[PDB]
Ligand binder design. Structure first.
Ligand SMILES: [Zn+2]
Length: 134
RNA sequence: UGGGAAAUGCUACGCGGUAGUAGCAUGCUAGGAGCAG
């Protein structure tokens, strides 16, 4: 995985970073996961709001769907300090397990395990080329 | 002795096809830009 510095505008001098991934990983991941990702992005009015425009009154519909029948409602929100740098890898494994539950028929058992192994070898913990070294 | 067809032109109507013109909606593609995590 190659690492690079960003070039954008922000309100704190801490640096930002992007990471490019090799091509074979992207090809195989697209083929394995694309259908579910599209299905998630298409569905409207659910718990996950990825793919819902904030234009044309979509924002109002989201804010109304969350405001379902709650007797004494209040509003609550929180913040994760260093979410990307500090997520314990057990939860990442479990997250990658949930997304793969859809593959009951398109894949066997050993195929599922090897797909999980490739994912952990390519994205979870592997060799990062920063500067000029590994 | 209470029996009539066709070839021509005009007009009107409808259909079909052709072309050209304008409008509408969409589907694709390409390009450029902006926002968010
Ligand atoms: Zn599969």
């Amino acid at each position: 995985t190659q690492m690079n510095l960003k070039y954008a505008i922000s309100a704190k001098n801490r640096a930002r970073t992007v990471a490019g991934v090799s091509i074979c990983s992207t090809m195989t991941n697209r083929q394995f996961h694309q259908k579910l990702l599209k299905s998630i992005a298409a569905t409207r009015g659910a718990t996950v709001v990825i793919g819902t425009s904030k234009f044309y009154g979509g924002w109002h519909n989201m804010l109304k769907t969350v405001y379902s029948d709650v007797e004494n409602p209040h509003l609550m929100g929180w913040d994760y300090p260093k979410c990307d740098r500090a997520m314990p890898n057990m939860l990442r494994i479990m997250a990658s397990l949930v997304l793969a539950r859809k593959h009951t028929t398109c894949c066997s058992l050993s195929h599922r395990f090897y797909r999980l192994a490739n994912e952990c070898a390519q994205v979870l913990s592997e060799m990062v080329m920063c500067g000029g070294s590994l």
